[PDB]
């Protein structure tokens, strides 16, 4: 899993908004810099900027 290093507010409807410290499951990471992620903290799913998160434990 990954952790958010910054907050991120969605900029299109299918983005995922998240908070620093949130734990994320990366669901698709083959389409470019934006990854499809599922928040294990909120249960929501959407696209995220890959440079805002880092591998966690």
């Amino acid at each position: 899993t990954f952790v958010a290093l910054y907050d991120y507010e969605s900029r299109t409807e299918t983005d995922l908004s998240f908070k620093k410290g949130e734990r994320l499951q990366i669901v698709n990471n083959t389409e470019g810099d934006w990854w499809l992620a599922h928040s294990l903290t909120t249960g929501r799913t959407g696209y995220i900027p890959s440079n805002y998160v880092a591998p966690s434990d």
Partner: peptide, 12 residues
């Protein structure tokens, strides 16, 4: 915060 990357290539 980091610069946001350009959006991915849209798929057709």
């Amino acid at each position: 915060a980091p610069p946001l990357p350009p959006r991915n290539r849209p798929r057709l």
